[PDB]
Amino acid sequence: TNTKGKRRGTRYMFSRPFRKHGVVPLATYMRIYKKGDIVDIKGMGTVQKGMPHKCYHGKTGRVYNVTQHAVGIVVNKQVKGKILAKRINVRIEHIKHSKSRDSFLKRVKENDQKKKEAKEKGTWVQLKRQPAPPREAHFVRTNGKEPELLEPIPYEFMA
Amino acid sequence: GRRPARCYRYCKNKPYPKSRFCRGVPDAKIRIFDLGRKKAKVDEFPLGGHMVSDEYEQLSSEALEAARICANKYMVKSCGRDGFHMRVRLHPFHVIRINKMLSCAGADRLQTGMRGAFGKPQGTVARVHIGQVIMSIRTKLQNEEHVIEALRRAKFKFPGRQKIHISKKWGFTKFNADEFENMVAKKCLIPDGCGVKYVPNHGPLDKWRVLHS
């Protein structure tokens, strides 16, 4: 049997990456979070107060609370089946803004724009994304060379 | 003494190197990984003969022992006591284990069977991959056949199979042998006893000023 300890096996997880042991860069606690914002937890060794727990390391969740230097945040945690939407309290040093959201809200700001315009025209524009289509028959042109002849090369034991 | 090499032939368990975590290891049997005239120069021994493994297996410390000696003996011979250099390129590094021989007296009354099955260190063993070198010899280009036969006898002290191969390098370096003389004059390479130092167009200019001076 193994030990239930809160920081078991994190020997390699919470470890500051490389050539970064030291002062936390001050930007990381001067960006703002407000309820609704989506956040990806990523623990960190230097700050021990308010750490998450290793099963949330790498997970995302939205924000529901904001205290003086921590953020209440709801993530999903799968347990033997049933997924429990549970809310944890994590100090800011272990948190980033997830740009996972931000591809859309840029497809949105552009979709809303491309619909307000081209509405004075009435021309229906492709608003939906659409997966990578078949590559659309074209030409190839060799100019004045035949292709280069390739031959499988004779084996020889290198060692 | 020791179980036949059968039982410790395959690489089953993760490497068990001698460290603070296993101790009391009996010192490896093979000790001297190179003999002959290890005081040679690169400029006087152009024949990189190899003995390359063909199977992913283990080699006992005591095997590398006999394989070296029996090659020292078909060498200094036809070659002479000065005319070669022999390298063993597998240091027995991984520690092999033995459950304690299930020792019993008379018929028996008890042994506990398997409780604490974990056993003691018994010896050491080399890990070998396909296409990895075991032994390498270097002599004069004159003496090719006697490298082939001296390595051919050492095959018979080894389990599995291994091909004998003559390298395109110069002696023990990494440099293709058709190119050595060219990279020696104009000093892309500088003699360093056995090996040789590859000097690039990188460093301070005064480091050059020594050469071509």
Partner: protein, 75 residues
């Protein structure tokens, strides 16, 4: 009388037979867990919305008649 000591063998089957359910989320989730000084204030904000409903109602008809004028000026 030794026995097996553990396994997660066909467990994936079992808890996926009723198809692991991401927790059904409604709008308007509970405020339980938010810091008291927020609520202890936002309840006073909510409790006195009505004091100031006259401003809200007349100012609603102002924009409702200014945008009934904006949609009629378009007409």
């Amino acid at each position: 009388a030794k026995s097996k000591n553990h396994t997660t063998h066909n467990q994936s089957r079992k808890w996926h037979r009723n198809g692991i359910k991401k927790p059904r989320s409604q709008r308007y989730e509970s405020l339980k867990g938010v810091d008291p000084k927020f609520l202890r204030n936002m309840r006073f904000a909510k409790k006195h919305n009505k004091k100031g409903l006259k401003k809200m109602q007349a100012n609603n008809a102002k924009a409702m008649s200014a945008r009934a004028e904006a949609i009629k000026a378009l007409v």
